[PDB]
Amino acid sequence: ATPSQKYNSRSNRGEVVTSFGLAQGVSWSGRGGAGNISLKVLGCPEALTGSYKSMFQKLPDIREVLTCKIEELGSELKEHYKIEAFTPLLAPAQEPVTLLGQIGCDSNGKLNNKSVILEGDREHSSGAQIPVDLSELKEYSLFPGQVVIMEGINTTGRKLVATKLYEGVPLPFYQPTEEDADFEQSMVLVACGPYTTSDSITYDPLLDLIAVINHDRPDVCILFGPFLDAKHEQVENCLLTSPFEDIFKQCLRTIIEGTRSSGSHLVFVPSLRDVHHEPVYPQPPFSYSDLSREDKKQVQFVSEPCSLSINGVIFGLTSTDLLFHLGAEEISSSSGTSDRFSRILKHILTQRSYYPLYPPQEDMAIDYESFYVYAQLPVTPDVLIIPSELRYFVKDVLGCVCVNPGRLTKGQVGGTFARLYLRRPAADGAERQSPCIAVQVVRI
Amino acid sequence: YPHCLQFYLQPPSENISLIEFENLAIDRVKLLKSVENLGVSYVKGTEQYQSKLESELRKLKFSYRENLEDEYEPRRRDHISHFILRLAYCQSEELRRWFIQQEMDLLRFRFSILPKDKIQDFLKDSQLQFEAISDEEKTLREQEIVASSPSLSGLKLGFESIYKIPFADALDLFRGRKVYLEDGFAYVPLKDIVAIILNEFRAKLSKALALTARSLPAVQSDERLQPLLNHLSHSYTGQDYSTQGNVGKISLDQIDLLSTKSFPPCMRQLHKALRENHHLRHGGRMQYGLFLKGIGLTLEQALQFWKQEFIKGKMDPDKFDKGYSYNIRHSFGKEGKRTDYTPFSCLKIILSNPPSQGDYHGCPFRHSDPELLKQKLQSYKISPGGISQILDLVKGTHYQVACQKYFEMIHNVDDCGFSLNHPNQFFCESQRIL
Amino acid sequence: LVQQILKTERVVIPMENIQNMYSESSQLLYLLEHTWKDAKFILQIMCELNVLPLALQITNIAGNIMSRTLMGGRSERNEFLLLHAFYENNYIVPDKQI
Amino acid sequence: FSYSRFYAKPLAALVTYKGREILMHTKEMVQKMNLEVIYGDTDSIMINTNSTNLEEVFKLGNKVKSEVNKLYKLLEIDIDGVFKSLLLLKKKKYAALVVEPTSDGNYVTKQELKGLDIVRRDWCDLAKDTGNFVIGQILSDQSRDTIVENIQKRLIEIGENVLNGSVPVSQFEINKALTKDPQDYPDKKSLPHVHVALWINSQGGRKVKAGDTVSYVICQDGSNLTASQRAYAPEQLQKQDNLTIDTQYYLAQQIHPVVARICEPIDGIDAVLIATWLGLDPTQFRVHHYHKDEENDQLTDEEKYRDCERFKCPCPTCGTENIYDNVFDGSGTDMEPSLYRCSNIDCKASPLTFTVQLSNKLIMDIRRFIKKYYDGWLICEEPTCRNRTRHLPLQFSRTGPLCPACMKATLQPEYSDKSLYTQLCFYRYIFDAECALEKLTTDHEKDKLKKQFFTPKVLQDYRKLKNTAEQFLSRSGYSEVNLSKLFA
Numbered sequence A: 001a002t003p004s005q006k007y008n009s010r011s012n013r014g015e016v017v018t019s020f021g022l023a024q025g026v027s028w029s030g031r032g033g034a035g036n037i038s039l040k041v042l043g044c045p046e047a048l049t050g051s052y053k054s055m056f057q058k059l060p061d062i063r064e065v066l067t068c069k070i071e072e073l074g075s076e077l078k079e080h081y082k083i084e085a086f087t088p089l090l091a092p093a094q095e096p097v098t099l100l101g102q103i104g105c106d107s108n109g110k111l112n113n114k115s116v117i118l119e120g121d122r123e124h125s126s127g128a129q130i131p132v133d134l135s136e137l138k139e140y141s142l143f144p145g146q147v148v149i150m151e152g153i154n155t156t157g158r159k160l161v162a163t164k165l166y167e168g169v170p171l172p173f174y175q176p177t178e179e180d181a182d183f184e185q186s187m188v189l190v191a192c193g194p195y196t197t198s199d200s201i202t203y204d205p206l207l208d209l210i211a212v213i214n215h216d217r218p219d220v221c222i223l224f225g226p227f228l229d230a231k232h233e234q235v236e237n238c239l240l241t242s243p244f245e246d247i248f249k250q251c252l253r254t255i256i257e258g259t260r261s262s263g264s265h266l267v268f269v270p271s272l273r274d275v276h277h278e279p280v281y282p283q284p285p286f287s288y289s290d291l292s293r294e295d296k297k298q299v300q301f302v303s304e305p306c307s308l309s310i311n312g313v314i315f316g317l318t319s320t321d322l323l324f325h326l327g328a329e330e331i332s333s334s335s336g337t338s339d340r341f342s343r344i345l346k347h348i349l350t351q352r353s354y355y356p357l358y359p360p361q362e363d364m365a366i367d368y369e370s371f372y373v374y375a376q377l378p379v380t381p382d383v384l385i386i387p388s389e390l391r392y393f394v395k396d397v398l399g400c401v402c403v404n405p406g407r408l409t410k411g412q413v414g415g416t417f418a419r420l421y422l423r424r425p426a427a428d429g430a431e432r433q434s435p436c437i438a439v440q441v442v443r444i
Numbered sequence B: 001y002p003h004c005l006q007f008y009l010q011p012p013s014e015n016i017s018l019i020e021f022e023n024l025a026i027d028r029v030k031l032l033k034s035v036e037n038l039g040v041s042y043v044k045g046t047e048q049y050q051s052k053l054e055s056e057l058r059k060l061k062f063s064y065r066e067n068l069e070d071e072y073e074p075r076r077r078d079h080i081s082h083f084i085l086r087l088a089y090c091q092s093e094e095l096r097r098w099f100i101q102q103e104m105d106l107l108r109f110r111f112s113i114l115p116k117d118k119i120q121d122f123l124k125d126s127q128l129q130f131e132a133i134s135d136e137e138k139t140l141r142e143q144e145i146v147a148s149s150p151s152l153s154g155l156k157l158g159f160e161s162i163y164k165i166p167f168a169d170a171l172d173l174f175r176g177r178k179v180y181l182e183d184g185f186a187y188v189p190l191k192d193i194v195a196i197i198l199n200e201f202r203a204k205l206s207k208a209l210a211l212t213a214r215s216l217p218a219v220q221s222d223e224r225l226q227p228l229l230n231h232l233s234h235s236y237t238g239q240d241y242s243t244q245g246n247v248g249k250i251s252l253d254q255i256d257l258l259s260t261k262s263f264p265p266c267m268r269q270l271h272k273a274l275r276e277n278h279h280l281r282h283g284g285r286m287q288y289g290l291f292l293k294g295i296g297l298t299l300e301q302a303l304q305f306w307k308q309e310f311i312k313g314k315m316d317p318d319k320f321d322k323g324y325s326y327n328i329r330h331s332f333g334k335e336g337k338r339t340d341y342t343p344f345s346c347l348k349i350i351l352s353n354p355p356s357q358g359d360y361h362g363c364p365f366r367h368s369d370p371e372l373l374k375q376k377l378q379s380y381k382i383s384p385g386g387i388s389q390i391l392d393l394v395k396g397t398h399y400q401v402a403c404q405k406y407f408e409m410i411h412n413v414d415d416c417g418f419s420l421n422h423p424n425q426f427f428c429e430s431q432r433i434l
Numbered sequence C: 001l002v003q004q005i006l007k008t009e010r011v012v013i014p015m016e017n018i019q020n021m022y023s024e025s026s027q028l029l030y031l032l033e034h035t036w037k038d039a040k041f042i043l044q045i046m047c048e049l050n051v052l053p054l055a056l057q058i059t060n061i062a063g064n065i066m067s068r069t070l071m072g073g074r075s076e077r078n079e080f081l082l083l084h085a086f087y088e089n090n091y092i093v094p095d096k097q098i
Numbered sequence D: 001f002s003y004s005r006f007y008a009k010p011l012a013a014l015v016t017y018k019g020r021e022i023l024m025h026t027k028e029m030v031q032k033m034n035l036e037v038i039y040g041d042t043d044s045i046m047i048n049t050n051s052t053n054l055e056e057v058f059k060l061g062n063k064v065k066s067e068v069n070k071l072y073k074l075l076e077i078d079i080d081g082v083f084k085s086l087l088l089l090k091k092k093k094y095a096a097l098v099v100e101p102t103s104d105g106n107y108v109t110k111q112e113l114k115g116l117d118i119v120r121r122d123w124c125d126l127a128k129d130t131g132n133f134v135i136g137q138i139l140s141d142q143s144r145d146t147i148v149e150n151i152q153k154r155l156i157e158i159g160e161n162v163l164n165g166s167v168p169v170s171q172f173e174i175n176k177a178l179t180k181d182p183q184d185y186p187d188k189k190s191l192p193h194v195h196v197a198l199w200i201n202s203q204g205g206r207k208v209k210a211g212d213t214v215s216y217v218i219c220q221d222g223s224n225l226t227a228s229q230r231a232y233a234p235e236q237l238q239k240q241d242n243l244t245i246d247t248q249y250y251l252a253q254q255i256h257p258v259v260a261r262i263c264e265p266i267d268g269i270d271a272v273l274i275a276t277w278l279g280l281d282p283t284q285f286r287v288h289h290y291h292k293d294e295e296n297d298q299l300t301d302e303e304k305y306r307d308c309e310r311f312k313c314p315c316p317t318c319g320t321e322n323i324y325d326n327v328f329d330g331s332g333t334d335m336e337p338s339l340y341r342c343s344n345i346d347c348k349a350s351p352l353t354f355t356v357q358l359s360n361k362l363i364m365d366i367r368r369f370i371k372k373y374y375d376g377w378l379i380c381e382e383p384t385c386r387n388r389t390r391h392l393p394l395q396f397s398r399t400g401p402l403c404p405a406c407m408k409a410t411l412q413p414e415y416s417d418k419s420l421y422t423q424l425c426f427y428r429y430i431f432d433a434e435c436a437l438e439k440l441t442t443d444h445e446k447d448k449l450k451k452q453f454f455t456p457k458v459l460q461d462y463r464k465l466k467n468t469a470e471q472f473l474s475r476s477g478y479s480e481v482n483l484s485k486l487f488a
């Protein structure tokens, strides 16, 4: 009877809630489909294309994974800080040692300054666990699963008193070929569901989006699931009179069509909350055939997460709330003045995975077999789009434009989306010339 | 049956559901376990044999209906089934033999069914090289072929087709001068050609069961295949039947009677025990106990049965409840099953919990010693010549088969009409017959 | 090692109570007391298991070097065993690996 | 040896082979001598015989000996012991009675156990009491029957008394040694001791710290809270009025656990069996148990899906809950397709009508179960340990993950894959009319209803609830058994 009432009576409409880069007017606009638009899917073997290989795991392999995880990073962290040799987490000694391991809590609760523990690697400490003493550590940022190199003293071999916590090391950023500097400015929109009010099935915001897509004629519109929110009240009590599979095609249409004039490439990103799709991270692309030869040049389906190249501009793509997770379980030495987020995100660029925090949020199934091949970062992203139930924002970090457009929708009220403007400048100088020149988070 | 004769050579590259993978084996075995029985109770040249044999070959769906070039229903069943059941029977050199034994008794039957003609085509095609000779070369060299042949009576070189093979492949026969040789070629009939097939078939099969083990370590790791590797003949039957639920209406004062004409050896012993001695060891209160529900006892009755049968043993009416009521109530009812509701299979009673002095459970045909058994069976009034067969069996280890032989005699028939593998079952047939 | 091999109780002293026993002669002499005993047990227990001997002979059949054989690591002993052999048999052998 | 100076992996395997080989060869032989082989391992072979006459057993051992050594030239089997009682719990883990012969007929009964250590020191007295109590009758010489009957006996009473209050208050005092200060314990709310310790400190004088041992029991607050959060101190128990002892807990989470670990192996006794012996706790108790544990023992349908969850769906019109456990409902004549009428008598709607919602809920009920299986919940096998952790250790045993609490127990998946694969197959068969009919005897009872209810539409309707699952099991939960991989 009322549905979306409050949503559509919104007055903040169009309001810019944050900017970044170089101030821009309100006249954001790209050339539509004009010129060359090079959308190349990147990562490890082309980031998965089919449904899967399975949905049955062999403990004997998850193990193998988690170990490589640590070994690999380690192997390279060891080459960077040039340490000479890690020490078994079980071998005692009076002199200071450099262990290798992954944090982890000692119980089922919230990791904390007391309960931290390090579980070494197989290759050196054949998986031994030794709790950690931090009293003697100045600056530290820890989270369960955090591959870490620590130096401290373990004399009894039943406790290590940390003395130093090496700083995480990220991957080099993408090396632009000469061709990528010859591309012109592009403007990427970006938005993530829910795409409807939690009290209606109107998808109103969806539409508003569309319109907005049109008006501004963006070059690329990367849209993050959930299209059909597994959590939307009506959906979980199965009151809908339509089959999920459909409903979803429905919206998929409205949007492909609703924006045929725009000339904007559409890049969809699946979500674990999309009731109709494979509840397994990493997820496979979406599935749809209803596409004219026309729309096939305009839409593209990609996994979750992903490393996509928008004009030699390496974007990072993940639908999972990696930030409201990592951040729910992280410990630090400072609270006075430090940027919680800028930190969590910092680990992300150094951990080299799209979800290092392990074990993973209580409701977020993962198949590590796949996770080893399809959820690693290729190179430090030039831009990172990390949606989240956490307030909007955009922080430059370790040379990466980390952007969280917030939710297009939030409960009964208006959300936001955001846009970026790109163009890789002149070849030489002090290297890092952020191809992402500006961005804006806007209500809708 | 048709182009259904196949040298299980070259491995299946398909893939199946753990439901087909598991059913192909249970079944593929049921067959091979029926090739075993028939060869024990009959002979390799009888209709009953040929009949029932192809009958199951039939019922298990392993020779029948066609289809579009690729997917030939039975063709497929038999191909996989065999290979899959190569895993299981590759281990014990006592299974490898038994397998080969029964998978060769099978190629034999699928050959005993084809006419001197269809078997010919299958060879030309099969491995690679074999040739038939026209009636020209056939009769031209006829006399010389019959001279080289065995004690082969008469001068009759029948219509029975004759083949020309490389002298080398017929070593087994020219070495004894049992075939005609010419410019490096041997001439033999069907009988002998076949035996050579079967011969090279065993040797190759064995060879493989060998290379099946070697690479077995790379799967024993898998959880879905433990029930095959380890249990295709444990407590769990070729494919038992009689489980729980089911119906029937038994009065009590009749069991005694049924004891003579219905239950098999095993239970017969137990009732007497419980009636004579007014009690029964642990091992026993279970074999019979269950079996009784399976024939259809009621919760009420079971208690009744034992209780009053434990009070003649001069026990404390209250101590029963306190000590036996409990277990007995469980049995019938709820969870914690697989050994508290699963009326013992025969293969079970035969391979677990043998009995000691004081115990009267287990299978007689298996567990009781020759003489004693002899003494037992005579009380049942089984023809002394009859008893002569049974024990001949018991000596072979075909334990229930014997039970079968006993079914027939106590019931008067030439063939019970089914292959036994569980007491209650043997209980029911004895009831169908009434 | 002592309750089993030597069939006798052997109390222990936690690094916690140490200091507090330096506060009075008696106690200090207990700490000392115990300390010894142990080193004795370490002797005894070494005796019960005819260790050193065992070791000799082993090391004499192998033809290696006593210490090693005491440290631990079966591979070594044998390693040698054969080493010697093959050596006596005009056989070139496996360069050690690393 | 991987890192030897004289390595040559082949030479080894070869040997290992002959090894495992020469073992069966032997195992068969024994069975071939109509003697039951109760265990084996690399070069050993336990053999139940049934003699009381030891003079006969060796004469027998040796008989074996001969035959076996007669076959080879060097290798040889050797007599090696005799047990006068044996409790084979599991791999390389047994309890038994060893024989040491005195002279000419008599001997000695030495108690030898291993792999039977309990780590947690927090088992109340009544447990340890009742615990040993059994372990003894078990190393008693009396008969299996005699042992167990007494064990039933005793236990039976345990309970009774437990209910009439004949058990000393202290006999329930559990005791744990904190290794963190109350506000540092994560699992907080769920750990009994740290709870009392917490109550205590913040409440009065003396404060608990590291190394200190704490005392607590479990009571009935009328708070319904999780057991964990219902931990009180012995003191505050007797001196308070409104609370009472929680018989339930101990009986179930204390006594049984122990006894169990020891009796599960006993043929004839089973988890539940004990549990009932201790009270009217059947149902819920079995619940406490597993689905898996029994994976030592092809099946039938009724039982293959017993443990799986019945599909439920409320009627989009009257609201009442509909329960679908199969294609049909009822027996013989009045057998209607469960999807025909709403369990609600006064409702007149045909669920078949709402094929969409059904196809929905299922989907939802199936995300649920795929998530669970995916949650990862690993649980220690040792009943006295039972550490529930989502963290897969890199420290592996031969069987699997190495429990990190008690360093001697493996973690076993809480919701197995097979436990799942069967919950989907259950949904699949609740709507496979196709097969629920070819399951009927006469082609008449068949047609009768095939024509009375299963109109091609209805059939389609079903093919849909069925295509629901199919897709799932399609490329998913390896229902697929790539034969190519298996032999290639």
Ligand code: SF4
Residues within 6 Å of the ligand: B264, B265, B266, B267, B345, B346, B347, B349, B362, B363, B364, B365, B399, B400, B403, B420, B421, B422, B423, B426
């Ligand atoms: S073998 Fe099977 S049938 Fe023959 S007695 Fe034993 S149980 Fe009854």
Ligand SMILES: [Zn+2]
Residues within 6 Å of the ligand: D315, D316, D317, D318, D319, D320, D342, D343, D344, D347, D348, D349
């Ligand atoms: Zn209704």
Ligand SMILES: [Zn+2]
Residues within 6 Å of the ligand: D380, D381, D382, D385, D386, D387, D403, D404, D405, D406, D407, D408, D409, D410
């Ligand atoms: Zn454990």
